[PDB]
Every structure is written in structure tokens, then in C-alpha cells.
Amino acid sequence: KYSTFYEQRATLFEELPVTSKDIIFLGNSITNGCEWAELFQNKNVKNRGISGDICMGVYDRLDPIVKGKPAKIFLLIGINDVSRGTSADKIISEISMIVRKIKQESPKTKLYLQSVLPVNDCYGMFNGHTSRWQVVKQINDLLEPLAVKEGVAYIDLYSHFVEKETGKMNPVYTNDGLHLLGKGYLLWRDIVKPYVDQK
Amino acid sequence: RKYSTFYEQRATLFEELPVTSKDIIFLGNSITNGCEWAELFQNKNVKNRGISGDICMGVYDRLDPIVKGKPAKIFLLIGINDVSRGTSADKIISEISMIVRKIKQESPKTKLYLQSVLPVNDCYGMFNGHTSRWQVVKQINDLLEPLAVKEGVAYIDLYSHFVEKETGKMNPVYTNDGLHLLGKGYLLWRDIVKPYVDQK
Ligand SMILES: [Mg+2]
Ligand SMILES: [Mg+2]
Structure with missing residues (x-):
């Protein structure tokens, strides 16, 4: 069904309680890679990233x-x-x-x-x-209208990471063309911190 | 190449995350990387310095931050x-x-x-x-405990709790691949190490 690594992370998440104060980062390797509570200096932020995850993999582990x-x-x-x-x-x-x-x-x-x-x-x-x-x-041209339809926020990280001239990620933020270096996470931090802090 | 690029991803992240005099660092390879340590211990001072694929000299080389x-x-x-x-x-x-x-x-x-x-x-x-x-x-463990004594640091015997009978192999209840831990595996590690984490 899913990878042995997915099972490891998912079974761990089944053992870690989520509370009404928690701020969850949910996603694949690009979410898994960060220390989110450290990035935001916020003990309420928690990592629910799993390297290799896909939309159905995330759907299937929403319950915990x-x-x-x-x-x-x-x-x-x-x-x-x-x-x-x-x-x-x-x-x-x-x-x-x-x-x-x-x-x-x-x-x-x-x-x-x-x-x-x-x-x-x-x-x-x-x-x-x-x-x-x-x-x-x-995807992003369809995801923004989905957010608006469903009454949820859309956050444009993409425009900060892309090169205008190529449509591709700026190599300053990556060593492989997919995942982020520390500089990458600092840019993501700067973009999303106002949303993490909002009441 | 995937381990080398992933090492540089994690290392460069850790160079941007400050360490303080209250922090409790879990340092190691995938088996350390795989946990949410602050959640496991319900302790905001506990931090993850694990990198999947890491080796002793890769840990040595990134001690500064x-x-x-x-x-x-x-x-x-x-x-x-x-x-x-x-x-x-x-x-x-x-x-x-x-x-x-x-x-x-x-x-x-x-x-x-x-x-x-x-x-x-x-x-x-x-x-x-x-x-x-x-x-x-x-x-390794038969030499690691004497090394701990010689250097005046604690040795923590996780191995005797994880091993099956007298096979010298990990109990399959803790793992789905023979190397990495299921959630049940991290709960056992938590139970063993929490009193050390909690030391004044
Ligand atoms: Mg680069
Ligand atoms: Mg098993």
C-alpha cells in the first residue's frame, strides 16, 4: 500500500497527541525535512511530514x-x-x-x-x-481557486522560490532541484510566520 | 548522492537554528532523524539533530553548530x-x-x-x-560501555530492551524493516531514556 518509512512515521504520529493549540505542517519530504518548532520558536508547531507522501497517503492518515x-x-x-x-x-x-x-x-x-x-x-x-x-x-493555477471555493487560505510560496526567467526553482534554495537547504526554510519561515502568528 | 545532498540539507538547516544552554539534543542517523523528540518527551527543550544516512565522521564534522x-x-x-x-x-x-x-x-x-x-x-x-x-x-556495545566509563560519560543500554530472547536481533514488534523503528519502538526508547532527559 505505502512505504515502510510511511508506516514508521504514521505509526509514530498515532502515538503523539494533537491538541486544540497545535499548528501542524502536513506534507511530503519538503515538510518532513524541517524542525518546525525551532524554525518558528513555537512549541505548538508540529511536523506531520513524511518523505515520499502523495495526496492519497495524506488523506489516509488524517484521523490522528x-x-x-x-x-x-x-x-x-x-x-x-x-x-x-x-x-x-x-x-x-x-x-x-x-x-x-x-x-x-x-x-x-x-x-x-x-x-x-x-x-x-x-x-x-x-x-x-x-x-x-x-x-x-x-497545479497552483487550480489550487488558488480551490482555496477560494472552500473558504480556506492560499499561500503563494512559489513566487518567492521561482526564477521569473525559467519557471524553475532558484538553485540558491536547493542542492538537488526538489528539496530545500537551510536558506530555503528561512525563506519559507519569512513568508508563513505572519500566518503561524495570526489569531 | 541522495544521502550526501540530504546531509547538506539537514546540516545547513541546523546552522540556522540556534542551540541554547537549556537544550537537550538527540544526535545521530535515521533512527534519531525519524522521531519528533519534543512531542515524545512533551518537552520544548528537546531538539532533533538526526540525519538519515549519517556516520560517525559525519556527526563529528557537524558538531560546531x-x-x-x-x-x-x-x-x-x-x-x-x-x-x-x-x-x-x-x-x-x-x-x-x-x-x-x-x-x-x-x-x-x-x-x-x-x-x-x-x-x-x-x-x-x-x-x-x-x-x-x-x-x-x-x-560495538561491548567496547562502547568501557569507553563511556573511561571518558566519565553515561552509557544507556537500549539494546537489551529491543533485542529478542538470545538471538541478538531486534524484536520484530519494534520494526517493519529490521533497522528503523515503528511508533511502538520510539515509545520503548522514550520509556528508557525519559529519566535521563528529566535529570536536574
Ligand atoms: Mg544550490
Ligand atoms: Mg514488525
């Missing part, structure tokens, strides 16, 4: 997050569905399933849909991901 | 990826000794805890370079 009725969920997902050849509209339909379930199970949770980050094939790594760099904007 | 903050405690778990490279228990211990002496020199007030290398199990046919070397885990 939404049952705690967290204050906030920041979602960043879809780039591993891109590497499977799934079209943008199909990915957005799956993200709609996630948003609908969070709203139904925990209506007081503030949900923030984060733009899929750009990617770059310059490093010749993750070719399934980085060769489909044009799908990122395709 | 941890020891400069003079943390209260460092819990070290390292070595199994050196085992998987065919490196001898003796050479592994020599590199752990380098880590211990550098921590003591740079941050003498830091309490250092050397955690037994965890057992492994070849029953899932995964990570063969690791799991087929299950006998090297006790070879």
Missing part, C-alpha cells in the same frame, strides 16, 4: 491529526503525484478530498493551502519530478 | 551506517571517542549520554549490509 482539532494545518503536497505522471486537475481533485475531510472532521481548524514549490532539473536528480517542472504552475 | 550553544544534554546514537560500510567495531569506537572528546573539550558543561547501538534483524530481507551484520552491534 483531525481528531485533536488542531488550531492550524499548513498543507504542502502533490509533487510526488506529479512524478507519477498524474495531471494537475487529478491532483487538485485529491487535494479537494483532503480539504473537505479536514473541514468536516475539524471545522474550527484554520487550513492553509501552500503553493506547490517549483523544481529544477539543473542537478540531474529526481528526473520524474524535475522534468515535469511545468506541472507546478498548472 | 550544536556544541557552540553549550547544550544541557546530548544523547548520541551513531554507528550502524558505519557497520553497513564494513567498518570494524574498533574503528567505529575510535571515531565515537573523537566525538566524545570534542564535545567534552568544546562544551565541558554538556552532559553526554552514549546510547547503545540498536540491534537489527535480517527477517524482512531489507537493508542487508546492515541487518546481515547483526553480530557487529554487540561487538
Whole structure:
């Protein structure tokens, strides 16, 4: 069904309680990679990232997050569905399933849909991901209208990470064309801190 | 290449995250990286300095952004990826000794805890370079506890709680691959190490 690493993380998350004060970062490797409470100097921020995760993988593990009725969920997902050849509209339909379930199970949770980050094939790594760099904007052009339809926030990380001239991630933020260096996380911190702190 | 790029991702992140005199650092490889330590201990002072794929000299090489903050405690778990490279228990211990002496020199007030290398199990046919070397885990631990005594630091026997009967292999209840931990595995680690974390 899913990877052994997914099972390790998911079974750990089943043992860690979520409370009404928690601010959850939910996603794939790009979420897994950070120390979120340290980045925000906020003990209420928690990591629910799993390297390799896909939209259906996130859907399938919502229960141990939404049952705690967290204050906030920041979602960043879809780039591993891109590497499977799934079209943008199909990915957005799956993200709609996630948003609908969070709203139904925990209506007081503030949900923030984060733009899929750009990617770059310059490093010749993750070719399934980085060769489909044009799908990122395709997703984001449909994700912003989804947010507006469902009454949830859309956060444009993408415009801060992209190079205008290429449509690809600025190499200053990555060593592989997909994941973030520390500088990358500091930029994400600067963009989303006002939303993390908002009442 | 994926381990080398992931190391630089995590290391460069840790260079941007300040360490303070209250902090309790979990330092190691994937088995440290895989936890949410502050959630496990319900303790905002506990921080993750784990990097999947890391080896003893990769931990040595990135001590500066941890020891400069003079943390209260460092819990070290390292070595199994050196085992998987065919490196001898003796050479592994020599590199752990380098880590211990550098921590003591740079941050003498830091309490250092050397955690037994965890057992492994070849029953899932995964990570063969690791799991087929299950006998090297006790070879290291039999030298690691004397090293802890010689350097005046704590040795933490996790291994005896995780190992099955007298097979010298990890109990499959704690793992789905013979190397890494399920949530149940981190709860056992929590139960063993919480009294050390809680030390005044
Ligand atoms: Mg770069
Ligand atoms: Mg098992």
C-alpha cells in the first residue's frame, strides 16, 4: 500500500497527541525535512511530514491529526503525484478530498493551502519530478481557486522560490532541484510566520 | 548522492537554528532523524539533530553548530551506517571517542549520554549490509560501555530492551524493516531514556 518509512512515521504520529493549540505542517519530504518548532520558536508547531507522501497517503492518515482539532494545518503536497505522471486537475481533485475531510472532521481548524514549490532539473536528480517542472504552475493555477471555493487560505510560496526567467526553482534554495537547504526554510519561515502568528 | 545532498540539507538547516544552554539534543542517523523528540518527551527543550544516512565522521564534522550553544544534554546514537560500510567495531569506537572528546573539550558543561547501538534483524530481507551484520552491534556495545566509563560519560543500554530472547536481533514488534523503528519502538526508547532527559 505505502512505504515502510510511511508506516514508521504514521505509526509514530498515532502515538503523539494533537491538541486544540497545535499548528501542524502536513506534507511530503519538503515538510518532513524541517524542525518546525525551532524554525518558528513555537512549541505548538508540529511536523506531520513524511518523505515520499502523495495526496492519497495524506488523506489516509488524517484521523490522528483531525481528531485533536488542531488550531492550524499548513498543507504542502502533490509533487510526488506529479512524478507519477498524474495531471494537475487529478491532483487538485485529491487535494479537494483532503480539504473537505479536514473541514468536516475539524471545522474550527484554520487550513492553509501552500503553493506547490517549483523544481529544477539543473542537478540531474529526481528526473520524474524535475522534468515535469511545468506541472507546478498548472497545479497552483487550480489550487488558488480551490482555496477560494472552500473558504480556506492560499499561500503563494512559489513566487518567492521561482526564477521569473525559467519557471524553475532558484538553485540558491536547493542542492538537488526538489528539496530545500537551510536558506530555503528561512525563506519559507519569512513568508508563513505572519500566518503561524495570526489569531 | 541522495544521502550526501540530504546531509547538506539537514546540516545547513541546523546552522540556522540556534542551540541554547537549556537544550537537550538527540544526535545521530535515521533512527534519531525519524522521531519528533519534543512531542515524545512533551518537552520544548528537546531538539532533533538526526540525519538519515549519517556516520560517525559525519556527526563529528557537524558538531560546531550544536556544541557552540553549550547544550544541557546530548544523547548520541551513531554507528550502524558505519557497520553497513564494513567498518570494524574498533574503528567505529575510535571515531565515537573523537566525538566524545570534542564535545567534552568544546562544551565541558554538556552532559553526554552514549546510547547503545540498536540491534537489527535480517527477517524482512531489507537493508542487508546492515541487518546481515547483526553480530557487529554487540561487538560495538561491548567496547562502547568501557569507553563511556573511561571518558566519565553515561552509557544507556537500549539494546537489551529491543533485542529478542538470545538471538541478538531486534524484536520484530519494534520494526517493519529490521533497522528503523515503528511508533511502538520510539515509545520503548522514550520509556528508557525519559529519566535521563528529566535529570536536574
Ligand atoms: Mg544550490
Ligand atoms: Mg514488525
